[PDB]
């Protein structure tokens, strides 16, 4: 239910060394609208990479979404590899994503599936 | 004492962080002030001590620098793209 950051970090640390992961903030899930204001704020906050409708796209690419169609937008906060000393970085990146997406974070494990924490 | 950065340079993100602290930059995720840096996952932004300089945005992919840009930190606007940059210490007293 309500995981601590320690619990989240320790779960990711249970993966083998060299495991690649992307830490995502699921800011919009299955919602209609252009989401122009959202994309603007995230660009203004200095983020680079987003996943919009399952396409990895860059911010400041002039992104326009159809208003009357549902969209999902994930901010790609970090792209990490499990290795010695990553603990603090995992914590920080997880925290950043949780703040962005109002207490949810998605971890995409490359070669495996996704983990949802909250 | 200078921290040299270039595209394709093999360096861990936290290694860059340590080196910045070593030269009197403070981590400040809550301020835009000169002589500090902020961290956003695999992006590190450095606000140089020098007046008239732009914020430097360093983008990592694994243990490699993939892109370095001059940016407006307040607005996120990209002002330039760089191959090579160098960060000197935040003070002349080291």
Short mmCIF file of C-alpha atoms in Angstrom, two decimals:
data_model
loop_
_atom_site.label_atom_id
_atom_site.label_comp_id
_atom_site.label_asym_id
_atom_site.label_seq_id
_atom_site.Cartn_x
_atom_site.Cartn_y
_atom_site.Cartn_z
CA UNK A 1 0.00 0.00 0.00
CA UNK A 2 2.00 3.04 1.25
CA UNK A 3 5.66 2.11 0.61
CA UNK A 4 8.60 3.95 2.19
CA UNK A 5 11.42 5.16 -0.02
CA UNK A 6 13.64 2.56 1.71
CA UNK A 7 11.20 -0.16 0.62
CA UNK A 8 11.21 1.07 -2.97
CA UNK A 9 15.00 1.31 -3.19
CA UNK A 10 15.50 -2.09 -1.60
CA UNK A 11 13.08 -3.65 -4.12
CA UNK A 12 15.08 -2.25 -7.08
CA UNK A 13 18.32 -3.38 -5.36
CA UNK A 14 17.02 -6.94 -5.44
CA UNK A 15 17.52 -7.03 -9.24
CA UNK A 16 20.83 -8.43 -10.60
CA UNK A 17 23.72 -6.06 -11.22
CA UNK A 18 23.71 -4.52 -14.69
CA UNK A 19 19.86 -4.47 -14.82
CA UNK A 20 18.75 -1.35 -16.72
CA UNK A 21 15.70 0.57 -15.40
CA UNK A 22 13.84 3.75 -16.31
CA UNK A 23 12.15 5.67 -13.47
CA UNK A 24 8.93 7.23 -14.83
CA UNK A 25 6.48 9.80 -13.38
CA UNK A 26 3.01 8.79 -14.72
CA UNK A 27 1.68 12.33 -14.80
CA UNK A 28 -1.28 11.67 -17.13
CA UNK A 29 -3.02 8.30 -17.53
CA UNK A 30 -5.82 7.79 -20.08
CA UNK A 31 -7.09 11.37 -20.05
CA UNK A 32 -8.49 13.42 -22.93
CA UNK A 33 -7.24 16.93 -23.67
CA UNK A 34 -4.29 18.44 -25.52
CA UNK A 35 -2.43 18.59 -22.16
CA UNK A 36 -0.58 21.64 -23.55
CA UNK A 37 -0.21 23.31 -20.12
CA UNK A 38 1.23 20.10 -18.65
CA UNK A 39 3.83 19.64 -21.41
CA UNK A 40 4.79 23.35 -21.04
CA UNK A 41 5.32 23.12 -17.25
CA UNK A 42 7.42 19.95 -17.55
CA UNK A 43 9.54 21.51 -20.33
CA UNK A 44 9.92 24.64 -18.13
CA UNK A 45 11.05 22.42 -15.21
CA UNK A 46 13.93 21.20 -17.40
CA UNK A 47 12.86 17.65 -18.22
CA UNK A 48 14.08 16.19 -21.51
CA UNK A 49 12.41 12.88 -22.29
CA UNK A 50 8.73 11.89 -22.13
CA UNK A 51 6.72 8.80 -23.12
CA UNK A 52 3.56 10.07 -24.87
CA UNK A 53 1.09 7.37 -26.01
CA UNK A 54 3.89 4.72 -25.95
CA UNK A 55 6.24 6.86 -28.07
CA UNK A 56 9.45 8.18 -26.55
CA UNK A 57 9.52 11.86 -27.43
CA UNK A 58 11.66 14.87 -26.59
CA UNK A 59 10.36 18.09 -25.07
CA UNK A 60 10.71 21.31 -27.14
CA UNK A 61 9.91 19.12 -30.17
CA UNK A 62 6.67 21.10 -30.69
CA UNK A 63 4.29 18.45 -29.35
CA UNK A 64 0.60 18.75 -30.28
CA UNK A 65 -1.99 16.24 -29.01
CA UNK A 66 -5.52 15.72 -30.35
CA UNK A 67 -7.92 17.19 -27.77
CA UNK A 68 -10.74 14.65 -28.22
CA UNK A 69 -8.49 11.57 -27.86
CA UNK A 70 -7.18 9.96 -24.63
CA UNK A 71 -3.49 10.27 -23.84
CA UNK A 72 -0.94 8.96 -21.38
CA UNK A 73 2.22 10.93 -20.53
CA UNK A 74 5.15 9.68 -18.48
CA UNK A 75 8.10 11.83 -17.57
CA UNK A 76 11.36 9.86 -17.93
CA UNK A 77 13.02 11.08 -14.77
CA UNK A 78 16.07 8.78 -14.73
CA UNK A 79 17.63 5.88 -16.65
CA UNK A 80 19.83 3.86 -14.35
CA UNK A 81 21.83 0.63 -14.15
CA UNK A 82 21.93 -1.44 -10.94
CA UNK A 83 25.49 -1.17 -9.66
CA UNK A 84 27.50 -0.45 -6.48
CA UNK A 85 26.48 2.80 -4.70
CA UNK A 86 23.29 3.57 -6.66
CA UNK A 87 21.12 3.66 -3.48
CA UNK A 88 21.03 7.47 -2.92
CA UNK A 89 20.47 8.13 -6.64
CA UNK A 90 17.57 5.64 -6.75
CA UNK A 91 16.05 7.38 -3.68
CA UNK A 92 16.42 10.85 -5.17
CA UNK A 93 15.07 9.86 -8.61
CA UNK A 94 12.11 7.94 -7.07
CA UNK A 95 11.31 10.99 -4.87
CA UNK A 96 11.46 13.33 -7.88
CA UNK A 97 9.02 11.13 -9.83
CA UNK A 98 6.65 10.73 -6.86
CA UNK A 99 6.43 14.51 -6.36
CA UNK A 100 5.72 14.95 -10.11
CA UNK A 101 2.95 12.32 -10.34
CA UNK A 102 1.23 12.96 -6.97
CA UNK A 103 2.54 9.89 -5.14
CA UNK A 104 2.88 7.30 -7.93
CA UNK A 105 6.02 6.10 -9.70
CA UNK A 106 6.54 3.54 -12.48
CA UNK A 107 9.81 1.65 -12.92
CA UNK A 108 10.36 0.14 -16.36
CA UNK A 109 12.73 -2.81 -16.01
CA UNK A 110 14.45 -3.24 -19.36
CA UNK A 111 13.98 -6.86 -20.54
CA UNK A 112 11.23 -7.43 -17.98
CA UNK A 113 8.01 -5.58 -17.18
CA UNK A 114 7.10 -2.58 -15.05
CA UNK A 115 6.83 -2.05 -11.26
CA UNK A 116 4.23 0.33 -9.87
CA UNK A 117 4.98 1.84 -6.42
CA UNK A 118 2.96 4.22 -4.23
CA UNK B 1 41.25 21.76 -10.24
CA UNK B 2 39.09 22.51 -13.32
CA UNK B 3 36.33 20.02 -14.19
CA UNK B 4 36.47 19.36 -17.94
CA UNK B 5 33.39 17.91 -19.59
CA UNK B 6 32.90 16.73 -23.14
CA UNK B 7 30.36 14.72 -25.13
CA UNK B 8 31.23 11.02 -25.02
CA UNK B 9 33.29 11.42 -21.85
CA UNK B 10 33.11 8.33 -19.66
CA UNK B 11 32.30 9.52 -16.14
CA UNK B 12 29.64 8.47 -13.62
CA UNK B 13 27.08 11.11 -12.70
CA UNK B 14 27.96 10.97 -8.98
CA UNK B 15 31.67 11.24 -9.91
CA UNK B 16 30.87 14.57 -11.54
CA UNK B 17 28.87 15.53 -8.42
CA UNK B 18 31.80 14.77 -6.09
CA UNK B 19 34.20 16.76 -8.27
CA UNK B 20 31.83 19.78 -8.23
CA UNK B 21 31.58 19.64 -4.43
CA UNK B 22 35.41 19.37 -4.36
CA UNK B 23 35.58 22.79 -6.09
CA UNK B 24 33.08 24.50 -3.74
CA UNK B 25 29.86 24.08 -5.68
CA UNK B 26 26.97 23.18 -3.40
CA UNK B 27 24.10 20.94 -4.30
CA UNK B 28 20.94 23.04 -4.29
CA UNK B 29 17.82 21.46 -5.76
CA UNK B 30 15.80 24.35 -4.26
CA UNK B 31 17.76 27.43 -5.64
CA UNK B 32 19.01 28.88 -8.99
CA UNK B 33 21.98 30.67 -7.45
CA UNK B 34 25.47 30.89 -8.93
CA UNK B 35 28.10 28.48 -7.63
CA UNK B 36 25.61 25.67 -7.05
CA UNK B 37 24.22 22.74 -9.05
CA UNK B 38 20.85 20.95 -9.20
CA UNK B 39 20.17 17.29 -9.97
CA UNK B 40 17.16 15.88 -11.86
CA UNK B 41 17.76 12.13 -12.45
CA UNK B 42 20.31 11.78 -15.29
CA UNK B 43 20.43 15.58 -15.83
CA UNK B 44 22.81 17.82 -13.85
CA UNK B 45 22.57 21.60 -14.19
CA UNK B 46 25.48 23.76 -13.10
CA UNK B 47 25.06 27.45 -12.40
CA UNK B 48 28.58 28.79 -12.94
CA UNK B 49 30.15 31.16 -10.41
CA UNK B 50 30.89 33.60 -13.23
CA UNK B 51 28.42 36.41 -13.92
CA UNK B 52 27.18 36.57 -17.57
CA UNK B 53 27.57 32.82 -18.00
CA UNK B 54 24.67 30.55 -18.75
CA UNK B 55 23.53 27.51 -16.83
CA UNK B 56 25.20 24.37 -18.22
CA UNK B 57 22.94 21.31 -18.63
CA UNK B 58 24.76 17.97 -18.67
CA UNK B 59 22.79 14.99 -19.93
CA UNK B 60 23.96 11.47 -19.06
CA UNK B 61 23.17 8.11 -20.67
CA UNK B 62 24.64 5.49 -18.30
CA UNK B 63 28.24 6.47 -17.46
CA UNK B 64 28.55 8.68 -20.55
CA UNK B 65 27.85 12.34 -21.23
CA UNK B 66 25.55 12.41 -24.24
CA UNK B 67 24.73 16.11 -24.57
CA UNK B 68 25.82 19.43 -23.07
CA UNK B 69 23.72 22.56 -23.50
CA UNK B 70 23.70 26.17 -22.44
CA UNK B 71 20.24 26.85 -20.97
CA UNK B 72 18.04 29.47 -19.24
CA UNK B 73 17.45 27.70 -15.88
CA UNK B 74 14.39 29.75 -15.06
CA UNK B 75 12.53 28.85 -18.26
CA UNK B 76 14.24 25.65 -19.51
CA UNK B 77 15.03 27.30 -22.85
CA UNK B 78 18.02 25.91 -24.76
CA UNK B 79 20.43 28.70 -25.82
CA UNK B 80 23.37 26.69 -27.20
CA UNK B 81 24.86 23.23 -27.74
CA UNK B 82 28.42 22.36 -26.74
CA UNK B 83 31.09 19.71 -27.43
CA UNK B 84 33.50 20.78 -24.63
CA UNK B 85 33.01 22.93 -21.46
CA UNK B 86 35.06 23.50 -18.30
CA UNK B 87 33.92 24.34 -14.78
CA UNK B 88 36.38 26.23 -12.61
CA UNK B 89 36.14 26.37 -8.79
CA UNK B 90 33.29 28.38 -7.22
CA UNK B 91 35.87 30.47 -5.33
CA UNK B 92 39.46 31.60 -5.93
CA UNK B 93 40.13 30.44 -2.35
CA UNK B 94 40.54 26.67 -2.63
#
